[PDB]
């Protein structure tokens, strides 16, 4: 494969949607890891979580506008939409990441 | 005061979850500018029990402190606690918050 999974346009990202997507210890930790380690394979996050719940987590991160997910080959690789979030919500990301605790 | 957690039990995912809703975010946005607000300043097209759950979520997550004065419920942003635990978060959020 060589394509990006569905992601909203900058136009359709809302502040409540982003906060909801960050509003979970697992998702917050995903974003924390994506912010510090760059792109990560979907399997990179082993949290002792039901795979259905982890799948829902990434889907929320994608649909909310936080995460850009790419499918290359068999696996899905995840990336923080840093420019989109900074342009829409200056200071939000750094404010959230400065306050997060390493899960 | 109504139910409210101790500062030790306020977490960031819980605060962000409480803010991650347009009605709840609107409540916080009003309380930040116009200060301690009683009463039905939060008149949205929402079920009464659902607006009540919104306030319960805001209280349980450590965002809002509510006290009863007469028949009225005076709500107050826990700015001190939130700034103490999560400096800059509230401003980062309010800077981009738009009226609903």
Numbering used by the authors:
A (entry chain A): 0 to 102
B (entry chain B): 3 to 102
Article passage:
PCC 7120, one such strategy is the use of an ArsR-SmtB transcriptional regulator RexT that senses H2O2 and upregulates expression of thioredoxin to maintain cellular redox homeostasis. Different from many other members of the ArsR-SmtB family which bind metal ions, RexT has been proposed to use disulfide bond formation as a trigger to bind and release DNA. Here, we present high-resolution crystal structures of RexT in the reduced and H2O2-treated states. These structures reveal that RexT showcases the ArsR-SmtB winged-helix-turn-helix fold and forms a vicinal disulfide bond to orchestrate a response to H2O2. Each protomer of RexT has an α1-α2-α3-α4-β1-β2-α5a/b architecture.
To visualize the structural consequence of Cys residue oxidation, a 2.16-Å resolution structure of H2O2-treated RexT was solved (RexT_Ox). The oxidized structure shares a similar overall architecture with that of reduced RexT (rmsd of 0.380 Å for 1258 atoms). In chain A of the RexT dimer, a slight orientation difference is observed for both the Cys40 and Cys41 sidechains relative to the reduced structure. To form this disulfide bond, Cys41 undergoes a large conformational change: the sidechain flips −167.8° and moves 8.8-Å away from its position in the reduced structure. Formation of this vicinal disulfide bond results in the creation of an eight-membered ring with the peptide backbone and distortion of the peptide bond geometry. In addition to this observed peptide bond distortion, the movement of Cys41 disrupts the interactions seen in the reduced structure between the backbone and sidechain of Cys41 and residues His75 and Asn77 from the wing of the wHTH motif. The lack of a disulfide bond in chain A is proposed to be due to crystal packing, which would prohibit a comparable movement of these residues. Through this analysis, it was found that a cavity leads from the surface of the protein to a cluster of amino acids that includes Cys41. In the oxidized structure, the newly formed disulfide bond is oriented towards the protein surface and perhaps coupled with the architectural changes in RexT, more favorably interacts with reduced TrxA2 and permits subsequent resolving of the disulfide linkage.
